Design a protein around this ligand. Structure first.
Ligand SMILES: NCCCCCCCC(=O)NO
Ligand SMILES: NCCCCCCCC(=O)NO
Ligand SMILES: [K+]
Ligand SMILES: [K+]
Ligand SMILES: [K+]
Ligand SMILES: [K+]
Ligand SMILES: [Mg+2]
Ligand SMILES: [Mg+2]
Ligand SMILES: [Mg+2]
Ligand SMILES: [Zn+2]
Ligand SMILES: [Zn+2]
Lengths: 346, 346
C-alpha cells in the first residue's frame, strides 16, 4: 500500500463550542473535536503515512481568498461579544434581509449578521486560533504536494467549503480548499480544479471563483431545494462572465446510493479531464455516508475505497481537505478509506 | 377631556411564544402578552374612550401590502414546521447570505430564512391568528377615522413596522401601519403620512412605500449603526425613483432625552406640514422610555403627554398603531399618555 502524509493540528481542539441552533433549540454541536481525533486515530492505526504538524504561514495566503475586514472580524469577534455583555456563545440574531442594505455596521451583533449565512455556527474562545490552524493545515498539505508529494491529506477542523470571501457559516470560517487552490495558482500552477464530494454544496468555493476560468469548481451534493445551503448549488449555476462554464453543480435526491452518485462523480471526472488542470483539491466530506445524521445519501464505508481509487486515476497532484461527516464511530474508517483507496487499497 | 376609541383583540394572546434568541441564549421573549393587557387595563382605568373588538376584513387589505406567497407562508409555517419533526419553536437557522440567490426553496427551513431578517421572532401555534387579528385591529381603527372620528388607537399585538412586503422580523409579521395607510389610499385619501416614533427604525414601512410619493414615511430611531435593524434607517435613505424626497430618517445616539428627541419630532412635523397629507398613521412605540430594557433613549412618562399634544396640533385624521415598548410596569401609562395628550391632557 502506497503512503500518504497527513497534516494535523492539535489546536483544532481550541474550537469546542457547546451550542448549535437546530430546529428551534440549542443542541450539542455536530462538528465536534472527536471527528478529527477519530480520523487521526485511524490514520495512525492504519499506518497511512507520516503525520506532520502545520507550518505557520500567516494571514497572507488566507487574504488571497478572504477580505481583510472579514479576517479582522474573526480575530476580534469573541472579545467584542463578551465585552458587549452577551452571556451565550456568539450567534447572529439578525442579518441583511432581502430589501436591506449590504452595509457594514459598527455594532457587534450587526457585524455578526453581516458576515454570516446561518445561525448554527457558534463562535467562542479559540475559534480564531482553530480556524487559523486549519488554514495552515491545508497550506502545509499544499506545500507537501507542490514540493514533490503526489498527494497529502489536510485533516482540517473546522471545515471550510461554505465560507465565502467574507461570509462564514455551515461550520466553516476560512475556506481551506479555496486557500489551497489559490496557493497552487500563486505558485505557478496555471489551472486548478476543486472537486467537492461533501454531501453539501461547496457554496463558498463556488462564490470565491465564480467569475474565474483558471479555477474549475465542481460540487456533488444533495438538492439545495431540500438541504443546506438552500440558496446556491443549483445545476443552472454554471459561472459568471469569464467564469462561464467553469462551475458545475451535480445535485442528487434523498436515498441516492453510490451506484447513482458515482455516475455524477464520473461526469465530474470527465469535466476535469477536459479542463486539464495542473493541480486538484478535493474538498472531502464523508457526510455522504448512509448513517450520517444530517444527510440523506446512502454510501457505505467500502464505497469510500472506490471513491479514493477513482480520484487517483485522475493522475493529478491532489490535496484532500477534510470537510463534513458526522457519524463519528464510522468517520475514521470512512475518511481514511478514501486515502487508502487512493493509495491502492480495495 | 376629549375621548378616543381603542380597538383591541383578545386573539393577541394566541401568540405566546416561549423562546427568543438573544445574546446566544433562548430567553423569555420581550414582546409578551402582558404588554397588550397592561395597556388595555390603563385604557379602561383612564376611561380614555370606548373599547371595541375589530371586524374581520379578510386577507384583501393585507395583500395590498404583502405578497400572496408571504401571506401563504405565514399561514402554513407552523404546521409545516411540526410536520417536519422540529421540536423547538419555528426559528430560522440560515438565510440568503450576501452572495447567495434570492430564490424561494421548497424546504421549510429554507423558506423560514428566505422570509425573515432575524431569528428573534419565533413562530408557534396561534401566531397566524394573532397576526391576522392585529391587522384587523389596525383596519378597524382606520375605518373609525374614515367614518368620522378624529383619531383611533389600534392596540396592535403583534407589532408591524419591521415587516416588509415579504419579510418578517423584529417581532412583526404584518405591517399594520402600512396596511392602515394603504386602506386610507384605497378609500380616496390622496396622500398619507406614516410617522414612526418607536425607538427602532420602521424599516418595513420604509421599504413598502420607498418608491412612492403618495405615502410619506418618517422615522425617528436609534442609530442603526448601533441597534436593530442595522441595515436600514440611515439618514441618507431618502427614497428612490418617484419616492425620492418622500422618506425621512432621523437618528439619535445613546442617552438622547426628550429635549433633543423633540427637536427631531419638530423636523418631522414640519416635513408632514409640507407634505400636506389627508391622513396620518402614527407607528407608536414607547420603547423610547428611559427604563426600556432593550433601548437607549431617556423619555419620561410625562414626555408622552407632550408627544400626544404635538401630534394633535398637526390637525390630521390620525390612526395610532401599537408597536414596541418592553418595560411592562410603565407601558400602559406611557402609551395611554400619548392618547390622553392627544385629547388635551397635560
Ligand atoms: N443546525 C443546522 C444543521 C444544518 C447543516 C449544516 C451543513 C454543514 C456541513 O456538513 N457542510 O459540509
Ligand atoms: N432583542 C433585541 C432584538 C432587536 C429587535 C428589536 C425590535 C423591538 C421593537 O420594539 N421594534 O419596534
Ligand atoms: K459537495
Ligand atoms: K470557476
Ligand atoms: K421609529
Ligand atoms: K415614500
Ligand atoms: Mg448590539
Ligand atoms: Mg454509525
Ligand atoms: Mg430542512
Ligand atoms: Zn457537508
Ligand atoms: Zn421598537
Amino acid at each position: 500500500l502506497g503512503s500518504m502524509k497527513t497534516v494535523f493540528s492539535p489546536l483544532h481542539s481550541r474550537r469546542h463550542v457547546k451550542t448549535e441552533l437546530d430546529g428551534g433549540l440549542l443542541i450539542e454541536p455536530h462538528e465536534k473535536p472527536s471527528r478529527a481525533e477519530t480520523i487521526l486515530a485511524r490514520v495512525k492505526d492504519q499506518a497511512l503515512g507520516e503525520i506532520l504538524e502545520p507550518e505557520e504561514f500567516g494571514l497572507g495566503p488566507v487574504k488571497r481568498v478572504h477580505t481583510a475586514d472579514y479576517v479582522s472580524f474573526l480575530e476580534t469577534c469573541w472579545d467584542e461579544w463578551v465585552a458587549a455583555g452577551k452571556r451565550g456563545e456568539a450567534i447572529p440574531t439578525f442579518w441583511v434581509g432581502r430589501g436591506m442594505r449590504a452595509r457594514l455596521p459598527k455594532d457587534i451583533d450587526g457585524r455578526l449578521g453581516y458576515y454570516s449565512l446561518g445561525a448554527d455556527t457558534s463562535i467562542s474562545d479559540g475559534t480564531w486560533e482553530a480556524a487559523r490552524a486549519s488554514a495552515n493545515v491545508a497550506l502545509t498539505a499544499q506545500k507537501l504536494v507542490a514540493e514533490g508529494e503526489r498527494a497529502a491529506f489536510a485533516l482540517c477542523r473546522p471545515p471550510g467549503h461554505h465560507a465565502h470571501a467574507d461570509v462564514f457559516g455551515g461550520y466553516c470560517f476560512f475556506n481551506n480548499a479555496a486557500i489551497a487552490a489559490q496557493a497552487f495558482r500563486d505558485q505557478g500552477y496555471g489551472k486548478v480544479a476543486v472537486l467537492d464530494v461533501d454531501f453539501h454544496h461547496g457554496n463558498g468555493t463556488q462564490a470565491i471563483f465564480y467569475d474565474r476560468s483558471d479555477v474549475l469548481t465542481i460540487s456533488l451534493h444533495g438538492d439545495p431545494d431540500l438541504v443546506f445551503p438552500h440558496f446556491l448549488g443549483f445545476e443552472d449555476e454554471t459561472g459568471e462572465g469569464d467564469g462561464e462554464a467553469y462551475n458545475l453543480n451535480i445535485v442528487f435526491p434523498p436515498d441516492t446510493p453510490f451506484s447513482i452518485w458515482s455516475q455524477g462523480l464520473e461526469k465530474a471526472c470527465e469535466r476535469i479531464r477536459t479542463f486539464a488542470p495542473d493541480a486538484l483539491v478535493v474538498a472531502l466530506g464523508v457526510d455522504t455516508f448512509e448513517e450520517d445524521p444530517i444527510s440523506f445519501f446512502k454510501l457505505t464505508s467500502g464505497d469510500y475505497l472506490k471513491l479514493g481509487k477513482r480520484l487517483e486515476q485522475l493522475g493529478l497532484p491532489t490535496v484532500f481537505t477534510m470537510e463534513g461527516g458526522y457519524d463519528v464511530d464510522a468517520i475514521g474508517v470512512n475518511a481514511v478509506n478514501v486515502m487508502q483507496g487512493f493509495e491502492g487499497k480495495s
